[PDB]
Design an enzyme around this catalytic site. Structure first.
Site, PDB file in Angstrom:
ATOM      1  N   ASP A  55       0.871  -1.264   0.165  1.00 17.86           N
ATOM      2  CA  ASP A  55       0.059   0.088   0.138  1.00 17.86           C
ATOM      3  C   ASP A  55       0.859   1.288  -0.109  1.00 17.86           C
ATOM      4  O   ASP A  55       1.494   2.001   0.836  1.00 17.86           O
ATOM      5  CB  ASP A  55      -0.867  -0.232   1.260  1.00 17.86           C
ATOM      6  N   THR A  56       0.762   1.775  -1.168  1.00 25.97           N
ATOM      7  CA  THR A  56       1.828   2.930  -1.216  1.00 25.97           C
ATOM      8  C   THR A  56       1.252   4.223  -0.611  1.00 25.97           C
ATOM      9  O   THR A  56       1.896   5.284  -0.231  1.00 25.97           O
ATOM     10  CB  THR A  56       2.061   3.478  -2.944  1.00 25.97           C
ATOM     11  N   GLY A  57       0.096   4.158  -0.156  1.00 24.79           N
ATOM     12  CA  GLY A  57      -0.472   5.585   0.529  1.00 24.79           C
ATOM     13  C   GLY A  57      -0.133   5.370   1.975  1.00 24.79           C
ATOM     14  O   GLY A  57      -0.538   5.984   2.970  1.00 24.79           O
TER      15      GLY A  57
HETATM   16  C1  LIG Z   1     -14.064   2.608  -0.626  1.00 22.24           C
HETATM   17  O1  LIG Z   1     -12.825   3.001  -1.153  1.00 22.24           O
HETATM   18  C2  LIG Z   1     -11.856   3.261  -0.497  1.00 22.24           C
HETATM   19  C3  LIG Z   1     -10.940   3.909  -0.821  1.00 22.24           C
HETATM   20  C4  LIG Z   1      -9.662   4.367   0.180  1.00 22.24           C
HETATM   21  C5  LIG Z   1      -9.701   3.840   1.329  1.00 22.24           C
HETATM   22  S1  LIG Z   1      -8.306   3.909   2.633  1.00 22.24           S
HETATM   23  O2  LIG Z   1      -9.001   3.922   3.839  1.00 22.24           O
HETATM   24  O3  LIG Z   1      -8.236   5.716   2.506  1.00 22.24           O
HETATM   25  N1  LIG Z   1      -7.172   2.875   2.216  1.00 22.24           N
HETATM   26  C6  LIG Z   1      -7.189   1.540   2.802  1.00 22.24           C
HETATM   27  C7  LIG Z   1      -6.853   1.248   4.118  1.00 22.24           C
HETATM   28  C8  LIG Z   1      -8.225   1.423   5.046  1.00 22.24           C
HETATM   29  C9  LIG Z   1      -5.921   0.119   4.519  1.00 22.24           C
HETATM   30  C10 LIG Z   1      -6.051   3.456   1.653  1.00 22.24           C
HETATM   31  C11 LIG Z   1      -4.678   3.398   2.451  1.00 22.24           C
HETATM   32  O4  LIG Z   1      -3.419   3.790   2.053  1.00 22.24           O
HETATM   33  C12 LIG Z   1      -4.830   4.678   3.726  1.00 22.24           C
HETATM   34  C13 LIG Z   1      -4.503   6.110   2.975  1.00 22.24           C
HETATM   35  C14 LIG Z   1      -4.785   7.335   3.770  1.00 22.24           C
HETATM   36  C15 LIG Z   1      -3.926   7.726   4.742  1.00 22.24           C
HETATM   37  C16 LIG Z   1      -4.139   8.736   5.758  1.00 22.24           C
HETATM   38  C17 LIG Z   1      -5.530   9.136   5.705  1.00 22.24           C
HETATM   39  C18 LIG Z   1      -6.472   8.700   4.819  1.00 22.24           C
HETATM   40  C19 LIG Z   1      -5.990   7.727   3.707  1.00 22.24           C
HETATM   41  N2  LIG Z   1      -4.332   4.525   4.834  1.00 22.24           N
HETATM   42  C20 LIG Z   1      -3.132   4.611   5.451  1.00 22.24           C
HETATM   43  C21 LIG Z   1      -3.080   4.075   6.476  1.00 22.24           C
HETATM   44  C22 LIG Z   1      -1.870   4.064   7.539  1.00 22.24           C
HETATM   45  O5  LIG Z   1      -1.148   5.418   7.372  1.00 22.24           O
HETATM   46  C23 LIG Z   1       0.012   5.506   8.034  1.00 22.24           C
HETATM   47  O6  LIG Z   1       1.050   4.981   7.670  1.00 22.24           O
HETATM   48  N3  LIG Z   1       0.051   6.756   8.807  1.00 22.24           N
HETATM   49  C24 LIG Z   1      -0.043   8.252   8.410  1.00 22.24           C
HETATM   50  C25 LIG Z   1      -0.835   8.845   9.489  1.00 22.24           C
HETATM   51  C26 LIG Z   1      -0.759   8.605  10.770  1.00 22.24           C
HETATM   52  C27 LIG Z   1      -1.304   9.413  11.659  1.00 22.24           C
HETATM   53  C28 LIG Z   1      -2.354  10.389  11.235  1.00 22.24           C
HETATM   54  C29 LIG Z   1      -2.563  10.712   9.881  1.00 22.24           C
HETATM   55  C30 LIG Z   1      -1.757   9.910   8.718  1.00 22.24           C
HETATM   56  C31 LIG Z   1      -1.397   9.637   7.322  1.00 22.24           C
HETATM   57  C32 LIG Z   1      -1.034   8.427   6.773  1.00 22.24           C
HETATM   58  O7  LIG Z   1      -0.230   8.342   5.665  1.00 22.24           O
HETATM   59  N4  LIG Z   1      -4.219   3.674   7.148  1.00 22.24           N
HETATM   60  N5  LIG Z   1      -5.218   3.823   6.059  1.00 22.24           N
HETATM   61  C33 LIG Z   1     -10.865   3.048   1.753  1.00 22.24           C
HETATM   62  C34 LIG Z   1     -11.798   2.733   0.934  1.00 22.24           C
END
Ligand SMILES: COc1ccc(S(=O)(=O)N(CC(C)C)C[C@@H](O)[C@H](Cc2ccccc2)n2cc(COC(=O)N[C@@H]3c4ccccc4C[C@H]3O)nn2)cc1
Lengths: 99, 99
Positions: A25-27
């Site tokens: 997961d690149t994001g």
């Molecule tokens: C229905 O379609 C969907 C599209 C996207 C998503 S998602 O939730 O946005 N998703 C999948 C996930 C549940 C595993 C993508 C995922 O890459 C997200 C990206 C993201 C990051 C931050 C906010 C919103 C979306 N994702 C990343 C993580 C873990 O993240 C971290 O490593 N920590 C950082 C961090 C730490 C503290 C506070 C904020 C942030 C931003 C992060 O980049 N979990 N989900 C879910 C459903």
């Protein structure tokens, strides 16, 4: 190998002597796994995503094998609904994005 | 181009005649943007992530330019804390993962 994104980029990982499936997961800056049995110490942590925040356990220097590539690094464990491999390990296995 | 993951894979996008920055995100099935002004109709929706659920507006057939590559497709708008490009558009711009 190369993987296209018409489907979820899921790979097989081995960690703590257990086999699991996880999302490339690149994001994600960090690697987060659903609750699992791990050895050794952990630090309490909080991470945020879409939806709100979760408390996780930060484990450091853990070995993980990712579709046959070893990596060593930080692994967070907690209420995530999907096993996620983040950039901290994706770089160690030489993974890149191309378009 | 190729992009490595030592930093967030952020790209410039153009949508609705506005310029924004967004995260190339292989673990997102769908494309989700923070609140913004878009024309036309939308459908109410809910998506889940780490942390819990969010209500979003689903917009269909929207044009978006992603680091100069046009794509047309579904875009969800709502309380996400980061602009995210998901697999539904990543495939259209020919994006792939390599390791
Ligand atoms: C229905 O379609 C969907 C599209 C996207 C998503 S998602 O939730 O946005 N998703 C999948 C996930 C549940 C595993 C993508 C995922 O890459 C997200 C990206 C993201 C990051 C931050 C906010 C919103 C979306 N994702 C990343 C993580 C873990 O993240 C971290 O490593 N920590 C950082 C961090 C730490 C503290 C506070 C904020 C942030 C931003 C992060 O980049 N979990 N989900 C879910 C459903």
């Amino acid at each position: 190998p190369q993987i296209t994104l018409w489907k979820r980029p899921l790979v097989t990982i081995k960690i703590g002597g257990q086999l699991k499936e996880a999302l490339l997961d690149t994001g994600a800056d960090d690697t987060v796994l659903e609750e699992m049995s791990l050895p050794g110490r952990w630090k309490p942590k909080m991470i945020g995503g879409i939806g709100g925040f979760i408390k996780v356990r930060q484990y450091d220097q853990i070995l993980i094998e990712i579709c046959g590539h070893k990596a060593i690094g930080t692994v967070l464990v907690g209420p995530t609904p999907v096993n996620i491999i983040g950039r901290n390990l994706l770089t160690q296995i030489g993974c890149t994005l191309n378009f």
